[PDB]
Amino acid sequence: DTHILVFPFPSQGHINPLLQLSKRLIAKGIKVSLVTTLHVSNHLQLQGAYSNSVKIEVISDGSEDRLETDTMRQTLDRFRQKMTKNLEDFLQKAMVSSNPPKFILYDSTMPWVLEVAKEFGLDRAPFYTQSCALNSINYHVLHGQLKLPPETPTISLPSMPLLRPSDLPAYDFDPASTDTIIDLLTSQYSNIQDANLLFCNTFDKLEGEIIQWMETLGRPVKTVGPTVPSAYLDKRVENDKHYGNEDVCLKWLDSKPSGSVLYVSYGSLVEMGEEQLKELALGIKETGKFFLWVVRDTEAEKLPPNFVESVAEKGLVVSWCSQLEVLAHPSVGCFFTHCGWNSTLEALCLGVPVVAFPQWADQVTNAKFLEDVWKVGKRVKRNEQRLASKEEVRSCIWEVMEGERASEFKSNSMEWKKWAKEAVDEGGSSDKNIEEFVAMLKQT
């Protein structure tokens, strides 16, 4: 029996892509052991009931956990030192056992895993869970052709679309952490010469030339995305309808005409100012369109006093909906999104045009691609003070849903939905790369 280790960065948020991929290759006959922390274990559903259910391997005791007193660097140092030792102790046992793992697939944000696998002679590959475009940016910042402060007004990287400085990832939200975050992202490409493969959460038709550029770094690149549940695409893997509730959103959507509703989500981790949140709320109201806005309790409290009351007819403002179920609903014609890589891929897979309102990090670069490269929507015009007016919000929504290019966006959205599904369906670019990896694993 062939089994591998999957070791994603242990944070609630980014372990889903690796789990989604795990489902693909559990279906192709590969057993998977999830390597994770005590903490993740407690907040994760306990081990499945089947023979080929993902096996949970807790290798830490909790002392790696970040402290309230820590700087990000200090948190990262303690995490690396302790988890290095933990992995070493784990493989010391696992490698000399009757069925030793054949591979370790680890999040690219933990490059020190490769050095541990190298010691044990264990086949290994990083997994880049963000866009291939970000791989190009972070690589070029590592090698010095791009600086943390852009040195020019237009950035023209090989095989990339032209980028303004405003299109580049902005990690200066916490200036204290900015240096540490840039170091972490650039260190993802330092030791790739010893990686068996480089896995990427994307597909060939979405970033084909960028992927071809990455292949010139000397290693086999395997595009295996998008990691959205099969049920919303090729529908070939049993269940796989969610990542890793009683819904009202679906009934409310059922009464609305096809393609008429704006789904609003500016991210489940993004905080927003009362000022900007007021302009956004009023801007959505001014369009006069049916809208479903999912915003969490702490964010929902910062809305204008009578806002929810005032949109009793057109607006459904709720604490939570199944984003995948809402996007797949035929009444939803447009998605106001913060352009997180997961939201971005979900919009493309479900063939829904976007009103892009990026906030931080890779969202800025994802927005650029959605508007100028994939052409499935528009970015809300910002101010000189980075504040979007309710008029800028209203016009952007109208232009995407009712403007000159409205039909272009939906047509392009349906094309990407087709191509995303084709990539993960039998014989697709992603399915082929996954079959190759599986075949390689059965060769030992």
Ligand SMILES: O=c1ccn([C@@H]2O[C@H](COP(=O)(O)OP(=O)(O)O[C@H]3O[C@H](CO)[C@@H](O)[C@H](O)[C@H]3O)[C@@H](O)[C@H]2O)c(=O)[nH]1
């Ligand atoms: O009401 C909601 C909100 C989200 N989701 C799902 O939960 C996941 C997380 O969504 P969200 O956090 O809104 O967006 P992402 O695209 O995952 O963005 C995440 O990852 C990005 C990386 O690009 C970061 O920039 C963002 O801060 C971070 O939220 C996705 O799979 C969504 O489908 C729901 O099911 N319901």
